[PDB]
From a paper:
SPH1118 has been identified as a pectin-binding protein involved in both pectin chemotaxis and assimilation. SPH1118 shows high homology with the solute-binding protein (SBP) associated with the bacterial ABC transporter. Here we show tertiary structures of SPH1118 with six different conformations as determined by X-ray crystallography.
These conformations were probably present in equilibrium in solution. The crystallization conditions of SPH1118 (open form), SPH1118 (full open form), and SPH1118 (closed form) contained the substrates (ΔtriGalUA or sodium PG). The crystal structures of SPH1118 (full open form) and SPH1118 (closed form) were obtained only under crystallization conditions in the presence of sodium PG. Compared to the C terminal domain of SPH1118 (full open form), those of SPH1118 (open form) and SPH1118 (closed form) were closed by 18.9° and 34.2°, respectively, suggesting that the domain of SPH1118 was flexibly opened and closed even in the substrate-free state.
Numbering used by the authors: 1 to 610
Amino acid sequence: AAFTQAPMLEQNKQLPPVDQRLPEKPLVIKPIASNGVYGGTLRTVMRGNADGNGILRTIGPQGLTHWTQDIQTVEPYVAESYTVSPDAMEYTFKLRKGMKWSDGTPFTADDIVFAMNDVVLNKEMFPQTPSAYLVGGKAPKVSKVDDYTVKFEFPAANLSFPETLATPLGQHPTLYQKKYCSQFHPAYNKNVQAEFTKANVKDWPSLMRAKCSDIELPSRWSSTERPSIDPWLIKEPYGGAVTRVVMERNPFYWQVDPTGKQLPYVDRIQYAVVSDLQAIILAATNGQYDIEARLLGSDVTSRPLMLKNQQKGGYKVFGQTSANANAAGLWLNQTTKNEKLRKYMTQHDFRQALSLAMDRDEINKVAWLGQAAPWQSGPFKESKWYNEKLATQYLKLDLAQANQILDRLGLTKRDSDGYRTYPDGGRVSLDAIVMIDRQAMVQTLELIRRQWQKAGVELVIKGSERSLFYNRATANDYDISIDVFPGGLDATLNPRAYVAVHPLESRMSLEWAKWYLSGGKQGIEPNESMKKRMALYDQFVAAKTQSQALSLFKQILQISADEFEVIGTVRPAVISSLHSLKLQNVNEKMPFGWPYATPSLSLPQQWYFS
């Protein structure tokens, strides 16, 4: 009885009063910076007519949980609260009594149970269940406990599930209104076949996708009648050839600010549909967008143009933090077929010397324009996974120490070109594979080649397109592979740099990874420290409590630090973004990435115009 609404809703005479449209207890959103005011149209942009995730990452997945701003944990979001059983298998969600869909009808456990059992877990709909809802490849039992309580029962520990529910790919539970969607489902509509010709499809899964959609389908944004719990609703749909998309506030949105205003603050979102980046950067520098945090930061050429024109365009450039720990890390192949090299590749002090012979300040200045600070492979300080050794050991150039180590390891005989040689002959030479489309990585290797020559080590660059790059890796035909190190902020989601579990990307040895993934039937058996990390990883995946998962995974990171298997160059540059100076409550320190649906991580329903 203390809630208010956007003035524009006063004119809609088929709406109940705002306190009746809200849940009994709406979710209260604390603003990023200040309490807001109603009004305005958020101007943003999509590139082409297959950029529908741009809508999703603008308005935000409305999942059962939501990431915190530092993406260190999640909180109840659509769910009022939830419990986790001691064995980490059972997840029980309480829902917000009185919450309604965009069409004013009830949002209840019926919708979640329909979404899971009749859509997600239906083998005609999804012959392969989306991995978001699996553990060890197995699905949960999903049950209605009462109108506002739903239970997920997995057959194995699954502590990641609340985090999964905060990602775009884990939002199916709240995406399907049973009332609307059941019309297109044969378990509920005996005459669903009559719907096929209407929708212009030939089977009921295609019909469901057409009318009710999926996370990333164009049909999610192509109709006005598909109910949702989104902060804004499609009004001018994202059509195959439309030039703009318009969305308008959901009168039944289920959140208020601390003063009782039903969110969102902003009345409408208008998406310009634009043909290419050249046109998008121009409009952005002209100040035609109130927010752009998806497309411009992918193109390293955009930042100078954006900064130059801030005052002209009335906008502020800000920098988001990529999840990757390293922009261009050296993956050293412990199972290189070069037998003479392998006897050195497997020695910690050899890898240490190579890191000490690198000048990361030069790499940063020359190949990354000074925007990418030296770093190894470890999580960042703002991550709960931070390990100082894993992040910072062996970062500083010490050519004398590198040469002293290499002398000590017996690589003292120089050939006629000045390079070190193995004790029984042969130049100390490492083949590094690189994708030429990663131009900054190629230049980084060129700088490393010049630096390592000062330590008597030859780096031979082998640039190719993607397919040959991956062919060589999977064939175990490389000494070094250069590519990102994940783990700056997403170490458990993407642990490939710390334990050899990714079949294509854990390039300290994909033969080790093949062994792990095949249960020892294929590949090459890893060394003891890696087998131990693999055992710790399996235990971490099966952990029953947060504190147990934390201690197990920290052990993996410590062993990875002690081994020093992969050599980082520089952490990624910030991702350049902009918001108009009038747009308030944008979290300018938020990370970047698809699992967090950025920029919607920042809660666009509490952005507002001053």
